Amino acid sequence: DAPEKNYERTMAILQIESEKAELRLKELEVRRLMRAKGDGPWFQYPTIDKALIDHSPKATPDN
Amino acid sequence: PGIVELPSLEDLKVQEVKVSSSVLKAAAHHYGAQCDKPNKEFMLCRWEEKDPRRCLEEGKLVNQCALEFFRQIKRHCAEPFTEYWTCIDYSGLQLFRRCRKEQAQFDKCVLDKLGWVRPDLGELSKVTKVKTDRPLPENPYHSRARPEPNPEVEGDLKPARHGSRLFFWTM
Ligand SMILES: CCCCCCCCCCCCCCCCCC(=O)OC[C@H](COP(=O)([O-])OC[C@H](O)COP(=O)([O-])OC[C@H](COC(=O)CCCCCCCCCCCCCCCCC)OC(=O)CCCCCCCCCCCCCCCCC)OC(=O)CCCCCCCCCCCCCCCCC
Numbered sequence: 001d002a003p004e005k006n007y008e009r010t011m012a013i014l015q016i017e018s019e020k021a022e023l024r025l026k027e028l029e030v031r032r033l034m035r036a037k038g039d040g041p042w043f044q045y046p047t048i049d050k051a052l053i054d055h056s057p058k059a060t061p062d063n
Numbered sequence: 064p065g066i067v068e069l070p071s072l073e074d075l076k077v078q079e080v081k082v083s084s085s086v087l088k089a090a091a092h093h094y095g096a097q098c099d100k101p102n103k104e105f106m107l108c109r110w111e112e113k114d115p116r117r118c119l120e121e122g123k124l125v126n127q128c129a130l131e132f133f134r135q136i137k138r139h140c141a142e143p144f145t146e147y148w149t150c151i152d153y154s155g156l157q158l159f160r161r162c163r164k165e166q167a168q169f170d171k172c173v174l175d176k177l178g179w180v181r182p183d184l185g186e187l188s189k190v191t192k193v194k195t196d197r198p199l200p201e202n203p204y205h206s207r208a209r210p211e212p213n214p215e216v217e218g219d220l221k222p223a224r225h226g227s228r229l230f231f232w233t234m
Contacts, residue, residue, distance in 0.1 A: 020228045027228070039213055061110040 070116055077126045082133065085152035089169070090136060090144065093179050095187040098128045107193045113203045140172040 034040040080087075087094075095102075105121035112118060136144055147165040151157050159166070173179050226234040 016225055020225050023224055024228055041213070041216060044213065057110050061106075061113055062115070063113065 068116070070119060074119060077123050078130060080126065080129050080133070083148075083152070085157055086148045088157055089148035089151045090133070092181045092187065093136075093173060094129070094132055096182050097179055098125075098132050099191070100193075101125050101128045103191055103193045104195060107195060108197065111200055111203065113200075135177065136173075139176045140169065143168045143172045 030040070031042070034042045038044075101121070101124040105118060105125045108118045108121045109115070115122075143165070147162065147169040150162040150165045151159070154161055170181050173181075226232060
C-alpha cells in the first residue's frame with residue numbers, strides 16, 4: 001500500500017473510533033441523567049393508567 | 064394543613080320532620096311526585112358540590128317543602144293517612160303489598176281533595192333534568208396543578224451511528 005493510502009485510511013479509522021468513543025461517553029451521561037431525574041424516554045417505570053378510572057355518578061355523593 | 068371550616072350551630076337549625084319511617088314510607092310516592100323540584104335541586108347540588116357544607120340552603124328548602132307536604136296532608140286527609148301508615152307500620156319489612164285497601168282509601172281521598180296523582184311504576188326512578196341558578200363547580204375535587212408530562216418522541220428514525228458501538232462490532 002501507499003503511505004498516502006495507509007495514512008488517510010488511518011485518519012478515517014481514527015475519525016470513526018473517536019466518534020464512537022464520544023458517543024459512548026454521551027451514552028453514559030444520558031443514562032446517568034435519565035436514571036437520576038427520570039424525565040426522558042428511558043427508565044419510565046409504569047404508573048396507573050387514568051383511563052381505568054370510573055367517572056360516573058356513584059351511589060353516594062361524597063367522592 | 065388548613066383549618067376545616069364548619070358551619071355554626073345556628074346554620075344547622077331547621078324545623079325537623081319528626082315522623083317515623085313508616086309514616087315517610089306511606090306517603091313516599093306522593094312525596095316524590097309533589098316535592099320533586101327542591102329535592103332534585105338538592106341532590107344535584109349534593110352530587111356536584113361534593114360537600115354537605117355547600118348544600119345547607121338546599122337542604123333547608125327540602126325540609127321546608129317536606130313540612131309543607133305533611134301539613135297539606137294533615138289538614139285534609141289525616142285519618143285515611145293514619146289508617147294507612149298504621150297498617151304499613153305493623154309489618155316488619157313494611158310491605159306495600161299487604162295494605163292495598165288502605166292505600167286505595169288514602170289515594171282516593173288525596174286525588175279527590177288535593178288532586179295529587181300517585182306515580183306509576185317506573186316514574187320516580189327516572190333521571191330528570193334540573194334548572195339551577197348556581198354556577199357549575201369548576202374544581203370540586205380541589206385538584207391542584209397537574210404535573211407536566213414527559214416530552215414525546217419526534218423526527219424520522221435515522222440509522223445508528225456506526226452500528227451498535229459495542230466495543231468492536233462495527234455493525
Ligand atoms: C450487490 C449484492 C451483492 C454484494 C456482495 C458483497 C459480498 C461479496 C462476498 C460474499 C461473501 C460475504 C461474506 C461476508 C462479508 C465479509 C465479512 C468479513 O470478512 O468481515 C471481516 C471481519 C471484521 O474485519 P474488518 O477488516 O474490520 O471488516 C472488513 C469488512 O468491512 C467486513 O464488512 P463489515 O465491516 O460490514 O463487517 C461487519 C462486522 C465486522 O466485524 C466486526 O465488527 C468485528 C466482530 C466480528 C466477530 C468477532 C467475534 C470474536 C469472538 C468469537 C470468535 C469465534 C471464533 C472464530 C472462528 C473460529 C472458526 C470457525 O461483521 C460482524 O461482526 C459479523 C460477525 C462475524 C462473521 C463474519 C462473516 C462470516 C461469513 C461467512 C461465514 C463462514 C464461517 C466463518 C467463521 C466463523 C466466525 C467468523 O473479520 C473478522 O471478524 C474476522 C473473523 C473471520 C470473518 C469471516 C470471513 C468471511 C469469509 C470466510 C470464508 C472462509 C470460510 C471457511 C470455512 C468456515 C470456517 C472453518
